[PDB]
Structure formats: C-alpha cells, structure tokens
Write a protein that binds this ligand. Structure first.
Ligand SMILES: Cc1ccc(CNC(=O)N2CCC[C@]3(CCN(Cc4ccc(Cl)c(Cl)c4)C3)C2)cc1
Length: 381
C-alpha cells in the first residue's frame, strides 16, 4: 500500500515510530529521497507550524534531524524528515556501533550541541530520551553522528523532570539529558533505577550513580556533571552551553593546559585570598594529605631538592606540574620516563594518582570564570 499526498508519499503499513501528541512516522519518499514522514494531527498543527518556521529561519545544525518539506490536506499535515539508521537505545544495548567510529563522549557532545541549538530558538523538546536520539545514516565516508528528533524508532518511562507531573523551560530537557548521559556511560543503567521504579524515585529524588567509581578520575568528572543536570532544583541545572564547557568533554591536552593556566593564574595570589583559600579548601583529601608520597620515586627524588613545595597544598601540586611541564625537555632521563609522552601520559600520571584534582580545581576556579584566560574552560555571557 502507498499514500500519495503530494511531492511527499509514504507507506501506511510501515510505521517507523510514534512520539509526542499522537504523531506517527511512516517510511516514505520525497524528491526521490528515502525519508521518514510524520503525520501531524489537528491538535498539533499550531505546535508544528511554529517549530517548522523557527527551524526554517535559522541555519541547519548537523545534530538536529533535517527537515525537508511539508504537505497539507484538510485533516492532517505531512512532514518529511531525515531517515535514520537506529536509535541511541540500540546503540547502547546492541554494542554494534563500537567499530563505527562514533565514541560515547562525542555522541553526547553532539546530543548536547543539538539540544543547545533548539534552546537558542526557544524550542523545548520535553520528550528527550534515548529513543528520541537517532544515529544517522552513514556518510559518504561511513561517518555517523547523533541527532535530536521528536520521534523514536521501533523502557520509555522515567525521563521526565520532577517539576512537570504550560511553558516549560530548557531546564526540563537538561534533566532528561542528565539521565541520558548516565545511560550511555553506564551502558544501559538509569540514575533513578529500573524502568518501572524510575518515575516514583524521581519525585522523592532517589538516584544512584554507583556505576561511576569514586576514585577513578574519568568517573569523578562525569559524576560532577551528571548530578548537577539531574538536580531536583531546576535552577541548579546548567544550560546546554554550560554542559558543553564541562571537563567531561576535554581532551587530555586540554586538561593539562587547564592546570597550567590555573597555575600561572594563582602564582601571585595572596594565599589568604578567596581564590587560593577556595582552592585550598578541598585541601588534604584531594592531595591525599601529602602529594609527595603519592608520586613515584624518580619524581620524588627530583623535587626533594626544591625548596618549599608544601605537600598539603593543591596550589603547590599544580605548581610542581606546571614546572615539570615547562622544563620537561631539560629534565633528567629517569624523570621523563616516569612522565613521558607529554601531554597525554604526563597528565594521566597525576590524574590517575589524584582523581579529584581536576574536579576540585574546576569548581574552585569558577571565580575566574569571567576572566578572559578561562573562557575556553567556562561559559560566560
Ligand atoms: C525536525 C522537525 C522537528 C519538528 C517539526 C515540526 N513539529 C513537529 O513535528 N512536532 C511533532 C510532534 C511534537 C512536537 C510538539 C513539540 N515539539 C518539540 C520538539 C521536539 C524535538 C525537536 Cl527536534 C523539535 Cl524541533 C521540537 C515537537 C511538534 C518539523 C521537523
């Protein structure tokens, strides 16, 4: 069977997905392209028109599903949208995409970038979940990407923010995004528990991130971001543009450059001042109360001669890293062997032995978020 309403045509017997206000998506064709075709019901006409026009009036974002064309009969609208290979649910559960080059963290960056593009248009998803996040068809070179969509393809409960249960703000989607982040990193777990118990745990705020290790650097960074996004108070949730600046997305090189930019910034500070007082507030726990005992012998031997370098100061640890990074070429051979392969192995050396160093430093240095030097690491204005 086939239905021809216009340049658009589709197959009623083939249903690709159902989201959001009685909308149903069928396989179809437009302009000799294979597309998915959404059927808009009269209740959704006003919502559709406003969003189509708003999307049409700005540039195309690679991480928002593409809009082709629309046709209208009396009883419905028909919108042709980009056809996709799979959902994020399949990507996480199936594991098939492991070798296709799209990594989990970069997938979340794309998902967040597309969500930020919608929020900049005053569009709120309100449905966001793994079923709604689609994996694109392969590129000419086989590259695939993640895309925001209102409909999923063929455990849907528990993705909704507590406050809704009407003009919601972006903060609703950030809560959903927070659950999606954990779902990808944990490979199928949800912060609020199993599918049937999620929505009740969301109202009383019972969440478990325990798939993230407390002493593992990578997991500590992710935990700090996720718990802010799924926070009960909507005002404590960061905007999508704030999320994109979190160290969760930084390359190893960018992490080491942050420590350097911080070290050069607090070099002249009063040490009674709020900056260093804030950074030293975490204190001994971050450095394990002596950071000279948590580093390997060749490094210990080299900086034992150096005066000062208080073992309980976070600033001094960052000062040592800054100095060994600067003199790296001129250091003794046995010292370069312990660090080596700069920046990657150099920064992993310290982050592996001090898993809270970057997270603690990032929260403490927010006081400089407005300053020009930290604009790569924070979002301001
Ligand atoms: C790619 C595209 C998107 C929307 C349209 C036109 N609208 C439309 O199809 N709708 C389907 C039914 C539900 C909604 C009401 C709220 N709306 C939120 C929302 C969620 C997700 C996205 Cl990506 C966007 Cl843009 C907006 C989705 C309207 C045409 C083409």
């Amino acid at each position: 069977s086939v239905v021809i309403v216009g340049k658009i045509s589709f197959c009623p017997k083939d249903v690709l997905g159902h989201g959001a206000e009685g909308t149903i998506v069928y396989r179809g064709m437009f302009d000799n392209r294979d597309v998915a075709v959404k059927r808009i019901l009269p209740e959704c006409f006003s919502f559709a028109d406003r969003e189509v026009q708003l999307l049409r009036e700005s540039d195309e974002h690679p991480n928002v599903i593409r809009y082709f064309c629309t046709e209208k009969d009396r009883q419905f609208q028909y919108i042709a949208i980009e056809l996709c290979a799979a959902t994020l649910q399949e990507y996480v559960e199936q594991k098939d995409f492991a070798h296709l080059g799209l990594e989990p963290i970069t997938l979340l960056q794309q998902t967040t970038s597309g969500l930020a593009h919608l929020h900049s248009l005053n569009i709120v998803h309100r449905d966001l979940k793994p079923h709604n996040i689609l994996i694109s068809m392969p590129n000419a070179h086989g590259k695939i990407k993640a895309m925001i969509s209102d409909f999923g393809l063929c455990g849907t409960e528990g993705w909704i923010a507590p406050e809704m249960l009407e003009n919601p703000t972006y903060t609703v989607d950030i809560f959903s995004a927070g659950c999606v982040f954990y779902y990808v990193i944990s490979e199928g777990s949800h912060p609020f528990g199993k599918s049937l118990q999620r929505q009740a745990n969301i109202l009383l705020g019972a969440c478990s991130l325990d798939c993230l290790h407390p002493e593992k650097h990578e997991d500590v960074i992710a935990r700090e971001l996720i718990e802010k996004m799924i926070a009960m108070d909507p005002q404590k949730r960061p905007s999508a543009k704030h999320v994109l600046k979190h160290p969760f997305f930084w390359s190893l090189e960018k992490q080491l450059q942050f420590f350097q930019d911080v070290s050069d910034r607090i070099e002249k500070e009063s040490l009674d001042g709020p900056i260093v007082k804030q950074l030293e507030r975490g204190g001994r726990a971050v450095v394990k109360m002596d950071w000279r005992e948590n580093i390997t012998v060749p490094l210990q031997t080299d900086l034992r001669k150096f005066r000062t370098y208080k073992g309980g100061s976070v600033r001094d640890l960052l000062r040592a890293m800054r100095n060994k990074k600067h003199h790296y070429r001129e250091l003794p051979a046995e010292v370069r062997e312990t660090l080596g392969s700069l920046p990657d192995d150099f920064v992993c050396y310290f982050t592996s032995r001090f898993p809270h160093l970057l997270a603690h430093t990032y929260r403490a240095m927010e006081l400089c978020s407005h300053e020009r030097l930290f604009q790569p690491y924070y979002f301001h204005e």
